[PDB]
Amino acid sequence: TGSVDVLFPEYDDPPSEPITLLKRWLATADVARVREPKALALATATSDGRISSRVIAFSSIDDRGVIFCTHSTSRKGRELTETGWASGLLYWRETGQQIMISGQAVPLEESENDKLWFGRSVPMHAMSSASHQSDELVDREALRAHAAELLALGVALPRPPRFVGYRLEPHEMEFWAASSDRLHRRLRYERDGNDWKTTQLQP
Amino acid sequence: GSVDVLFPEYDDPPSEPITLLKRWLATADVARVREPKALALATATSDGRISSRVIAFSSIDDRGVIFCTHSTSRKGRELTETGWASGLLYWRETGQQIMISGQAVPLEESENDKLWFGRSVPMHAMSSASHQSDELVDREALRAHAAELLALGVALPRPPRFVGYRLEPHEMEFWAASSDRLHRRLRYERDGNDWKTTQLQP
Ligand SMILES: Cc1cc2nc3c(=O)[nH]c(=O)nc-3n(C[C@H](O)[C@H](O)[C@H](O)COP(=O)(O)O)c2cc1C
Ligand SMILES: Cc1cc2nc3c(=O)[nH]c(=O)nc-3n(C[C@H](O)[C@H](O)[C@H](O)COP(=O)(O)O)c2cc1C
Ligand SMILES: O=C(O)[C@@H]1CC=CC2=Nc3ccccc3N[C@H]21
């Protein structure tokens, strides 16, 4: 299909919960053959307010938010511990859609972290265990050699404590869909206690 | 070809990270990357809540990345309040990311004019009609107003709220995917006066 004028009937009649709409949009993105729809630009900040960002491919979406895995000792992991707030942005060129998810990243339980680790491959385990994500790389060949050593053992590799999941639980979401006449469709959800309030925005 | 892109600068980094940004953008163009300038721009309000949206940046100069927006938009208010921004490029076709973090500095009025002047007639009409991010009261009315402005059939002046910023990098990261999962990560940071580079673990 085209990158303007996607159908968006929910603009005028929004579901009560934004996660419902998020899942709908993601499912349509798959029908539309969007390339890497789950590539989320995740922004976090340090205590002085300085913002950093990187792509995360999220794992799944449950009824409460967007689940992803990372190293708790990485830059994003340290920032999340410091300040809690995060924002994630999806953008699909093929359909002219963006989704902003702003919330807090809630650490998952250890049992959930284990299940996430078990869902990955042994090569992923080996590089994840060998690398302290975002720390200075001193010796690239040594790192590569250690990941190869771990793989060759053929033993189950334990989950390093830094490998953890978070749930990004939104307090605000925006759904944006391009229009060819430039009056883009913008639907904002904001938490309102146990409910949500929606607004349409000017482009 | 989304893995193991050529990256000699990983081991031999240019003195200025903008140099490498421009090199990568030129290669993205050769590789026919779709919308390579679509930056995920994050900002924050003073209480710490972060927000994000796509911005197609306008240009790059030796001091940073230039973009435009409405000063009264949600991002505009946040930029005024805290100054901090982080922009992220991601090119699926080549397995490359670039992170640009720093202060967004307002441009001068002459630079604002130039940015406005550079845009199209249809862009001007809707940008003049719409108060970006304010509540939309009546869709039909805003459409009609944009069309009326367009119909004036002359060059519309720059609305005062239409402004540019220069994102001046304090730190930049270049990431290139590797088929062996040991992704190439090159970080530049300002350490006092000049740039410190490091390679990072993936
Ligand atoms: C498509 C794509 C998906 C990625 N998914 C993840 C992920 O799920 N978890 C993760 O820790 N890093 C992921 N990364 C790597 C991050 O972009 C980043 O390099 C890393 O998490 C370190 O970020 P930090 O130094 O800002 O903490 C992904 C990168 C790309 C390009
Ligand atoms: C591809 C693309 C390019 C965009 N370029 C800009 C831009 O250069 N400036 C701008 O104000 N909004 C741009 N937008 C719209 C923003 O993503 C956003 O909807 C608008 O700026 C309001 O953001 P805010 O409410 O967070 O302030 C672009 C959107 C898309 C999808
Ligand atoms: O989509 C993927 O597997 C991601 C691609 C690139 C880097 C990644 N790094 C990770 C580090 C920790 C946990 C998950 C990751 N995902 C991949």
XYZ file of C-alpha atoms and ligand atoms in Angstrom:
484
model
C 0.000 0.000 0.000
C 0.677 3.793 0.192
C 2.373 5.878 2.872
C -0.442 8.440 3.177
C -4.109 8.028 3.935
C -3.941 4.697 5.919
C -7.405 3.911 7.365
C -7.645 4.920 10.968
C -11.247 4.666 12.028
C -10.254 4.790 15.703
C -9.235 8.458 15.291
C -12.852 9.368 15.686
C -13.815 6.552 18.024
C -10.850 5.490 20.176
C -10.675 2.228 22.109
C -10.786 2.762 25.878
C -7.211 1.469 26.306
C -4.326 2.506 24.016
C -2.583 -0.858 24.115
C -5.562 -2.254 22.209
C -4.828 0.226 19.390
C -1.134 -0.398 19.525
C -1.634 -4.130 18.954
C -4.061 -3.392 16.102
C -1.577 -1.081 14.405
C 1.213 -3.638 14.815
C -0.904 -6.357 13.304
C -1.792 -4.140 10.343
C 1.901 -3.266 9.915
C 2.573 -6.961 9.398
C -0.160 -7.151 6.740
C 1.335 -4.097 5.068
C 4.763 -5.804 5.064
C 6.443 -3.051 7.066
C 10.160 -3.696 7.395
C 11.262 -4.172 11.071
C 8.056 -2.746 12.589
C 9.291 -3.516 16.112
C 12.349 -1.317 15.923
C 11.669 1.104 18.782
C 13.761 4.280 19.243
C 14.027 4.164 23.026
C 15.030 7.364 24.854
C 16.171 7.537 28.435
C 17.889 10.235 30.507
C 20.521 10.653 33.147
C 20.041 12.578 36.381
C 21.076 15.945 34.879
C 18.402 15.603 32.189
C 20.723 14.610 29.322
C 18.864 12.271 26.939
C 20.298 9.269 25.084
C 18.599 7.019 22.553
C 19.068 3.732 20.669
C 17.037 1.164 18.794
C 15.506 -1.726 20.730
C 13.517 -4.479 19.074
C 10.850 -5.241 21.634
C 9.960 -8.801 22.526
C 6.217 -8.658 23.094
C 3.321 -6.531 24.299
C 1.130 -7.586 27.169
C -1.901 -5.869 28.663
C 0.221 -3.405 30.589
C 3.079 -2.413 28.221
C 5.945 -3.160 25.902
C 8.445 -5.826 26.997
C 12.107 -5.640 26.022
C 15.439 -7.053 27.137
C 18.776 -5.356 27.651
C 21.829 -5.275 29.937
C 20.989 -3.480 33.221
C 24.587 -2.198 33.241
C 24.365 -0.610 29.819
C 23.875 3.116 29.449
C 20.099 2.753 29.040
C 19.977 0.393 32.034
C 21.826 2.808 34.281
C 19.611 5.723 33.104
C 16.436 3.778 33.670
C 17.567 3.048 37.252
C 18.427 6.696 37.783
C 15.350 8.373 36.416
C 12.755 5.789 35.440
C 11.055 7.751 32.683
C 11.437 6.509 29.079
C 9.917 7.112 25.698
C 9.780 4.810 22.723
C 9.001 5.716 19.146
C 7.886 3.443 16.315
C 7.917 4.795 12.773
C 6.756 2.867 9.735
C 7.806 4.513 6.454
C 5.573 2.254 4.381
C 2.324 3.338 6.046
C 3.177 6.842 7.236
C 2.548 5.913 10.889
C 4.304 6.747 14.111
C 3.482 5.664 17.676
C 4.963 7.406 20.710
C 4.953 5.488 24.003
C 5.992 7.456 27.034
C 6.081 5.837 30.387
C 8.244 4.184 32.990
C 10.273 1.069 32.464
C 9.341 -1.461 35.206
C 11.831 -4.236 35.788
C 10.416 -7.729 35.271
C 10.573 -10.510 37.856
C 13.555 -12.894 37.869
C 11.352 -15.747 36.661
C 10.305 -13.626 33.682
C 13.926 -12.724 33.040
C 14.804 -16.435 32.993
C 12.020 -17.223 30.526
C 13.300 -14.400 28.239
C 16.831 -15.743 28.369
C 15.588 -19.278 27.538
C 13.861 -17.977 24.413
C 17.171 -16.947 22.857
C 19.783 -18.983 20.918
C 23.122 -20.295 22.241
C 25.042 -17.884 19.991
C 23.014 -14.988 21.393
C 23.751 -16.343 24.908
C 27.431 -16.548 24.190
C 27.833 -12.974 22.906
C 25.501 -11.588 25.567
C 27.541 -13.351 28.258
C 30.892 -12.238 26.767
C 29.922 -8.599 26.326
C 29.288 -5.999 29.007
C 27.033 -3.904 26.820
C 28.179 -0.261 26.438
C 31.353 -0.643 28.506
C 34.556 0.310 26.668
C 35.712 -2.434 24.293
C 39.411 -2.949 24.989
C 40.144 -6.022 22.952
C 37.736 -7.001 20.168
C 39.462 -10.222 19.247
C 39.532 -11.397 22.896
C 35.817 -10.733 23.186
C 35.100 -12.653 19.989
C 37.319 -15.552 21.208
C 35.530 -15.750 24.568
C 32.078 -15.852 22.907
C 33.385 -18.722 20.760
C 34.734 -20.552 23.851
C 31.291 -20.356 25.548
C 29.528 -21.732 22.503
C 32.004 -24.642 22.150
C 31.501 -25.859 25.731
C 28.000 -27.086 24.917
C 26.859 -26.454 28.486
C 23.730 -24.414 29.300
C 24.937 -20.849 29.894
C 23.521 -19.187 32.944
C 21.675 -15.965 32.659
C 24.086 -13.159 33.611
C 22.398 -11.035 36.270
C 22.700 -7.968 34.047
C 20.530 -9.601 31.376
C 17.064 -8.376 32.304
C 13.635 -7.483 30.942
C 11.636 -4.326 31.422
C 8.030 -3.493 30.722
C 7.549 0.008 29.310
C 4.212 0.933 30.906
C 2.728 3.972 29.255
C 1.217 7.038 30.859
C 0.912 8.735 27.448
C 0.711 7.465 23.883
C 0.277 9.213 20.538
C -0.820 7.602 17.277
C 0.025 9.567 14.150
C -1.011 8.728 10.583
C 0.058 10.750 7.572
C -2.526 12.368 5.308
C -1.882 13.502 1.767
C -3.675 16.865 2.430
C -1.177 17.344 5.338
C -3.872 17.316 8.058
C -2.280 14.341 9.665
C -4.342 12.250 12.072
C -3.039 12.677 15.629
C -4.647 10.866 18.532
C -3.228 11.435 22.012
C -3.975 9.208 25.013
C -3.051 10.423 28.486
C -3.592 8.566 31.745
C -6.462 9.934 33.827
C -6.327 7.873 37.039
C -7.754 4.474 36.231
C -8.927 5.659 32.868
C -7.542 7.350 29.815
C -8.379 10.701 28.216
C -8.037 11.186 24.468
C -7.481 14.294 22.394
C -7.037 14.969 18.653
C -4.095 17.261 17.891
C -3.238 19.769 15.177
C -0.450 18.611 12.843
C 23.450 -6.012 2.679
C 22.230 -4.938 6.091
C 25.278 -6.365 7.894
C 29.044 -5.860 7.898
C 28.861 -2.499 6.120
C 32.351 -1.005 5.489
C 33.520 1.055 8.497
C 37.245 1.851 8.392
C 36.637 4.834 10.655
C 35.827 2.443 13.496
C 39.577 1.955 14.016
C 40.650 5.326 12.625
C 38.053 7.962 13.610
C 37.849 11.425 12.046
C 38.674 14.269 14.444
C 35.074 15.618 14.233
C 32.031 13.371 14.490
C 30.076 15.587 12.039
C 32.581 14.530 9.372
C 31.594 10.894 9.873
C 27.885 11.775 10.025
C 28.093 13.418 6.613
C 30.081 10.459 5.211
C 27.470 7.987 6.410
C 24.603 10.068 5.047
C 26.298 10.189 1.628
C 26.728 6.420 1.623
C 23.068 6.001 2.701
C 22.133 7.920 -0.378
C 24.187 5.682 -2.658
C 22.550 2.668 -1.021
C 19.066 4.179 -1.682
C 18.122 4.140 2.007
C 14.486 5.128 2.385
C 14.057 8.422 4.317
C 17.568 8.415 5.790
C 16.999 11.822 7.434
C 14.006 10.716 9.527
C 15.323 11.345 13.024
C 13.605 10.034 16.140
C 13.921 13.184 18.222
C 13.475 12.879 21.953
C 12.997 15.824 24.288
C 11.923 16.207 27.914
C 9.980 18.436 30.178
C 11.573 19.697 33.409
C 9.889 17.014 35.585
C 11.664 14.364 33.531
C 8.962 12.894 31.328
C 10.438 12.190 27.886
C 8.599 12.501 24.593
C 9.538 11.593 21.054
C 8.529 12.185 17.405
C 10.000 11.914 13.921
C 11.724 14.978 12.508
C 13.162 15.094 9.000
C 16.186 17.290 9.612
C 16.827 20.102 7.204
C 20.627 20.213 6.933
C 23.917 19.708 8.772
C 26.583 22.350 9.315
C 29.922 22.147 11.139
C 28.227 22.889 14.479
C 25.253 20.490 14.319
C 22.008 19.274 12.827
C 19.429 21.841 11.765
C 15.686 21.264 12.033
C 12.480 23.269 12.157
C 9.266 23.090 14.100
C 6.639 25.235 15.838
C 7.903 26.863 19.029
C 4.462 26.416 20.622
C 4.368 22.691 19.852
C 4.896 20.186 22.661
C 8.546 19.602 21.611
C 9.001 23.382 21.264
C 7.920 23.970 24.839
C 10.242 21.178 26.062
C 13.187 22.521 24.089
C 12.608 25.943 25.665
C 12.315 24.425 29.144
C 15.296 22.092 29.192
C 17.237 22.375 25.949
C 18.249 18.715 25.890
C 17.556 16.556 22.830
C 18.594 13.222 21.357
C 18.100 12.302 17.788
C 18.388 8.795 16.426
C 18.831 7.717 12.800
C 18.318 4.039 11.912
C 18.775 2.653 8.392
C 17.309 -0.829 8.103
C 18.875 -1.367 4.692
C 22.441 -1.041 5.953
C 22.237 -1.984 9.671
C 23.432 1.440 10.827
C 22.354 3.731 13.642
C 23.558 7.176 14.527
C 22.779 8.790 17.864
C 23.180 12.586 18.156
C 22.683 13.967 21.683
C 23.200 17.502 22.869
C 21.533 20.898 23.320
C 19.093 22.225 20.799
C 20.026 25.875 20.322
C 17.489 28.265 18.821
C 18.554 29.777 15.513
C 18.561 33.463 14.717
C 15.603 35.089 12.976
C 17.437 35.367 9.637
C 18.145 31.660 9.771
C 14.486 31.020 10.623
C 13.434 33.001 7.560
C 15.801 31.050 5.365
C 14.416 27.766 6.663
C 10.835 28.892 5.988
C 11.736 30.231 2.549
C 13.198 26.919 1.586
C 9.905 25.039 1.985
C 7.083 24.450 -0.509
C 3.902 26.381 -1.105
C 1.597 23.546 0.246
C 3.842 23.172 3.278
C 3.515 26.854 4.042
C -0.268 26.776 3.885
C -0.797 24.019 6.420
C 2.103 25.167 8.641
C 0.482 28.670 8.778
C -3.052 27.292 9.394
C -2.118 24.754 12.076
C -1.004 25.431 15.605
C 1.044 22.323 15.944
C 0.109 20.079 18.876
C -2.685 22.296 20.147
C -6.013 20.480 20.466
C -7.844 20.098 17.132
C -11.297 21.515 17.596
C -12.664 21.100 14.059
C -10.877 19.106 11.351
C -12.962 20.470 8.507
C -12.339 24.027 9.585
C -8.582 23.569 9.676
C -8.604 21.920 6.240
C -10.606 24.801 4.808
C -8.314 27.382 6.394
C -5.176 25.756 4.955
C -6.840 25.667 1.510
C -7.814 29.323 1.799
C -4.213 30.256 2.644
C -2.968 28.213 -0.250
C -5.454 29.987 -2.530
C -4.015 33.416 -1.709
C -1.605 32.295 -4.430
C 1.297 34.242 -3.016
C 4.269 33.573 -0.808
C 3.153 33.371 2.787
C 5.242 35.041 5.490
C 6.943 33.124 8.226
C 4.650 32.609 11.234
C 6.418 33.764 14.401
C 6.052 30.298 15.904
C 7.889 28.672 12.942
C 11.503 28.351 14.178
C 14.678 26.410 13.683
C 17.083 24.815 16.084
C 20.621 23.520 15.802
C 21.216 20.293 17.646
C 24.807 20.786 18.874
C 26.255 17.392 19.707
C 27.716 16.701 23.122
C 27.930 13.028 22.249
C 27.440 10.921 19.130
C 27.406 7.184 18.579
C 27.862 5.294 15.363
C 26.623 1.656 15.322
C 27.054 -0.808 12.455
C 25.658 -4.349 12.623
C 28.030 -7.316 12.362
C 26.994 -10.793 11.255
C 29.002 -12.285 14.179
C 27.012 -10.117 16.629
C 30.080 -8.104 17.690
C 28.562 -4.890 16.388
C 30.896 -1.977 15.701
C 30.198 0.893 18.086
C 32.128 4.167 17.977
C 31.306 6.820 20.612
C 32.425 10.421 20.518
C 32.051 12.573 23.627
C 33.045 16.072 24.537
C 35.661 15.954 27.297
C 36.184 19.560 28.132
C 37.399 21.260 24.972
C 37.578 18.527 22.334
C 36.459 14.963 21.413
C 37.243 11.670 23.072
C 36.497 8.549 21.109
C 35.976 5.029 22.396
C 34.835 1.731 20.980
C 31.982 0.120 22.937
C 30.982 -3.471 23.687
C 27.802 -4.532 21.862
C 17.247 -3.415 15.080
C 17.993 -3.276 16.388
C 17.496 -3.916 17.483
C 18.135 -3.876 18.708
N 17.556 -4.521 19.775
C 18.146 -4.470 21.023
C 17.533 -5.038 22.148
O 16.441 -5.631 22.098
N 18.191 -4.934 23.356
C 19.386 -4.266 23.510
O 19.936 -4.225 24.646
N 19.971 -3.677 22.412
C 19.351 -3.783 21.168
N 19.952 -3.173 20.101
C 21.248 -2.455 20.345
C 20.985 -1.019 20.825
O 20.609 -0.222 19.715
C 22.214 -0.421 21.545
O 23.369 -0.521 20.721
C 22.505 -1.119 22.868
O 21.341 -1.600 23.535
C 23.333 -0.224 23.757
O 22.610 0.958 24.035
P 23.086 1.957 25.223
O 24.641 2.017 25.118
O 22.415 3.272 24.832
O 22.576 1.350 26.515
C 19.324 -3.186 18.859
C 19.856 -2.545 17.779
C 19.201 -2.596 16.530
C 19.782 -1.881 15.360
C 8.703 11.688 8.216
C 8.255 12.759 9.182
C 8.910 13.963 9.189
C 8.568 14.991 10.069
N 9.296 16.196 10.048
C 8.934 17.160 10.963
C 9.672 18.348 11.045
O 10.719 18.508 10.352
N 9.254 19.281 11.938
C 8.125 19.124 12.711
O 7.754 20.028 13.438
N 7.393 17.967 12.652
C 7.809 16.990 11.772
N 7.071 15.820 11.719
C 5.903 15.719 12.632
C 6.335 15.311 14.037
O 6.671 13.911 14.012
C 5.302 15.606 15.106
O 4.053 14.967 14.791
C 5.052 17.114 15.317
O 6.301 17.794 15.127
C 4.457 17.361 16.723
O 5.355 16.877 17.701
P 5.148 17.281 19.223
O 3.668 17.294 19.518
O 5.901 16.227 19.960
O 5.683 18.687 19.396
C 7.473 14.799 10.884
C 6.782 13.556 10.890
C 7.163 12.573 10.001
C 6.471 11.242 9.996
O 16.928 -7.744 17.002
C 17.899 -8.247 17.695
O 18.289 -9.438 18.066
C 18.839 -7.154 18.184
C 19.752 -6.712 17.039
C 21.045 -5.982 17.339
C 21.598 -5.964 18.604
C 20.887 -6.661 19.703
N 21.395 -6.619 20.971
C 20.750 -7.222 22.102
C 21.331 -7.191 23.397
C 20.605 -7.714 24.522
C 19.327 -8.271 24.374
C 18.750 -8.275 23.103
C 19.498 -7.731 21.951
N 18.892 -7.708 20.638
C 19.667 -7.546 19.405
